[PDB]
Amino acid sequence: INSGTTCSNDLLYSNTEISTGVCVNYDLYGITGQGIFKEVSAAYYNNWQNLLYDSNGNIIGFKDFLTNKTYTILPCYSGRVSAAFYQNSSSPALLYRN
Amino acid sequence: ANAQALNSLLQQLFNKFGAISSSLQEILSRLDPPEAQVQIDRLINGRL
Amino acid sequence: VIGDFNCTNSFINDYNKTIPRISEDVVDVSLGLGTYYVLNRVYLNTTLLFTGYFPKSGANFRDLALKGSIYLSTLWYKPPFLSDFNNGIFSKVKNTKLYVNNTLYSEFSTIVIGSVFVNTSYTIVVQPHNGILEITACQYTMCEYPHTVCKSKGSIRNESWHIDSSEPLCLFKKNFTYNVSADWLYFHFYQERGVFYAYYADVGMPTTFLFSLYLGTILSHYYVMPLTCNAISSNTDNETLEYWVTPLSRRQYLLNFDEHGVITNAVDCSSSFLSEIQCKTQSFAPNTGVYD
Amino acid sequence: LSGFTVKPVATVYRRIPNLPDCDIDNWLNNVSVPSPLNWERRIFSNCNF
Ligand SMILES: *[C@@H]1O[C@H](CO)[C@@H](O[C@@H]2O[C@H](CO)[C@@H](O)[C@H](O)[C@H]2NC(C)=O)[C@H](O)[C@H]1NC(C)=O
Ligand SMILES: *[C@@H]1O[C@H](CO)[C@@H](O)[C@H](O)[C@H]1NC(C)=O
Ligand SMILES: *[C@@H]1O[C@H](CO)[C@@H](O)[C@H](O)[C@H]1NC(C)=O
Ligand SMILES: *[C@@H]1O[C@H](CO)[C@@H](O)[C@H](O)[C@H]1NC(C)=O
């Protein structure tokens, strides 16, 4: 017990279903991070390629080996609000840029 | 010249500065809290 | 000596010279020979400055073929046939295609990577078969004189390089396929921070990824098993076995990817003065200026 | 003001296996039912079930 090399796949294969539109973490092939997914038609993957990277070294897509589908990972929104407040007011005016 | 300065500073988040990796999520997922502060301190002192 | 377990005491011939002949060609990376794709990454219409383990340009190989006969020897299992796996090796095997009984069969030697070659350690064995490549890294029991036989037109011996009752605690077991009607094969093996990598190709200059395994031990030994057969002699077909090996080292390279994701050009940053400028500006057509 | 951050849930995990499956369903569905006197035994190791 708690030894050897014969384990079970009753934990990692829980849902095996991914969404497209919400932000969630991922551990795809040892790569950790957060992002938003989006289905896209891609035909540049090979039999040994599963991740897509840019020159800077960031993952911008992947390919699932269980459904043969291609996606695109985009950074999730993390911004900052600029508010202006008067001398003796009660609530400042908010402005979300862009 | 302004674009090169912003892209050079952005690549500083991928350096290790002597740590085991560059992502803080990987450090906090493979090491215990007591021995994890020594790796995060190298990333904070390097990015600052 | 490879293992620490006596397995056979058959006929042994005299220790001949068996000079490790040196190839006459050199490594050329102008088209892709020597470089490899990333593990599972895709690059499109970009240029990448990869800092990995690549062979040095302008270097010769060394043959390690040990095609045996009805007899064997004890010097074959001794240096320099057992080199040091310091950082990695680069293989270039000839696809020995036979036509016995009007059948096209592809067989060649194997490669064994280990540290002490005992039961308490892990031994990586890559043994090729008829149209199928097998890779297993378990805790095998290496023999003192390991060898492999040929399927088509078998020898007067029997393949025996490990003896066990049950399968040990293995860490990797998977099969791969390759083109039977090929001409040359290429491989890549190296280590980095403990983990192990492997590559393979059958057509084209670059290679493809095979697997990535974590071991935690620093393996520093590799040996190629002989091939005992009676079909590649002088009286038999004139086919000869070839297994070239050249050391690898950590060096910078500049890869070019087209709009589809195929490596087109590659340059070594420590070859000439012009290549040093290309790796500094990350472009194959540098501008006009003075560079230090 | 301070940056607004959220904590996402429902992580995704993907990994390529390195060991073949045990394949016990095909062995248990054998057409040859052994007698209680035979009780043939097969050992499974280094596999996934
Ligand atoms: C990979 O290929 C090898 C070679 O064909 C397979 O080993 C065979 O297994 C069957 C079933 O146990 C035996 O009848 C054959 O004799 C084996 N061949 C040899 C050359 O030993 C192996 O099963 C395949 N799969 C894996 C996971 O290794
Ligand atoms: C994905 O495509 C490959 C090659 O066409 C095929 O072997 C595999 O079965 C496909 N996957 C699924 C889930 O159908
Ligand atoms: C590839 O990059 C070059 C240089 O930026 C550009 O001119 C060309 O349009 C790109 N091709 C594609 C298919 O994106
Ligand atoms: C195998 O190689 C032969 C010639 O070398 C070629 O005609 C054939 O298309 C190749 N097959 C594959 C699957 O690559």
Chains A+C touching (3+ CB pairs under 8 Å): yes
Instruction: Report the run of H or E that residue B39 belongs to, with start and end.
Output: helix B37-47
Task: Output phi, psi for A92, to 5 deg.
Answer: -75, 165
CB contact under 8 A, D19 and C173: yes
* Ligand nearest to C-alpha C257: 3
CB contact under 8 A, B23 and A32: yes
CA distances C291 to B8, C46, C254, C286, Å, are 20, 23, 18, 11
Q: Which of C179, C180, C185, C208 to mutate to test the pocket of ligand 4 (most atoms within 8 A of CB)?
A: C179
Which amino acid is it at C213? Answer: L
Nearest residue on chain B to A57, alpha-carbon basis: B14
Cβ-proximal residues to A72 (8 Å cutoff; 6+ apart), any chain:
A37, A38, A40, A60, A61
* Ligand nearest to C-alpha C202: 4
Chain A to chain C Cβ contacts (< 8 Å)? 38
Please count the CA atoms within 13 angstroms of the CA of C262 that sit on its side-chain side: 5
Report d(CA C197, CA B13) in Å as an integer: 27
Q: Structure tokens of B2? A: 């302004």
Q: Structure tokens of C254? A: 């500049």
Q: If you ran DSSP here, which 8-state letter would residue B12 be given?
A: G
Please count the CA atoms within 13 angstroms of the CA of C17 that sit on its side-chain side: 3
Do the strands C195-201 and C208-213 form a parallel or antiparallel pair, or are they unpaired?
antiparallel
CA C21 to centroid of chain Cα atoms: 17
Give the distance (Å) from ligand 3 centre to CA of residue A50: 23
Q: Is C259 in the pocket of ligand 3 (CB under 6 A)?
A: yes
Q: Structure tokens of C85? A: 């796996």
Query: What ranges make up the beta strands (E) of A1-98?
Result: 23-28, 31-36, 51-53, 59-64, 69-71, 82-84, 93-95
Tokens 């001794």 sit on residue: C78
Report d(CA B15, CA B44) in Å as an integer: 11
Do the strands C227-228 and C148-149 form a parallel or antiparallel pair, or are they unpaired?
parallel
Report d(CA A30, CA A36) in Å as an integer: 18
Instruction: Report the run of H or E that residue B37 belongs to, with start and end.
Output: helix B37-47
CB contact under 8 A, A32 and B11: no
Torsion angle of the four alpha carbons C52, C244, C148, C111, in this order, in degrees rounded to the nearest 10:
-10
Tell me the technique behind this structure: cryo-EM
Which amino acid is it at C188? Answer: H
Resolution in A: 3.0
Contacts of residue D18 in chain A, CB cutoff 8 Å?
Answer: none
Nearest Cα neighbor of C248 from C89, C96, C38 is: C89
Task: Output phi, psi for B26, to 5 deg.
Answer: -70, -35
Cα of first residue to Cα of last residue in chain A, in angstroms, is 57
Instruction: Report the run of H or E that residue B42 belongs to, with start and end.
Output: helix B37-47
Chains that touch D (3 or more CB pairs under 8 A): A, C
Instruction: Report the run of H or E that residue C273 belongs to, with start and end.
Output: helix C273-281
Report d(CA A27, CA C17) in Å as an integer: 54
Please count the CA atoms within 13 angstroms of the CA of C62 that sit on its side-chain side: 11
Q: Which of residues 13-42 of D touch A (CB under 8 A)?
A: 13-17, 19, 22
Tokens 């400042």 sit on residue: A92
Atom of ligand 3 nearest to the CA of C259: 13
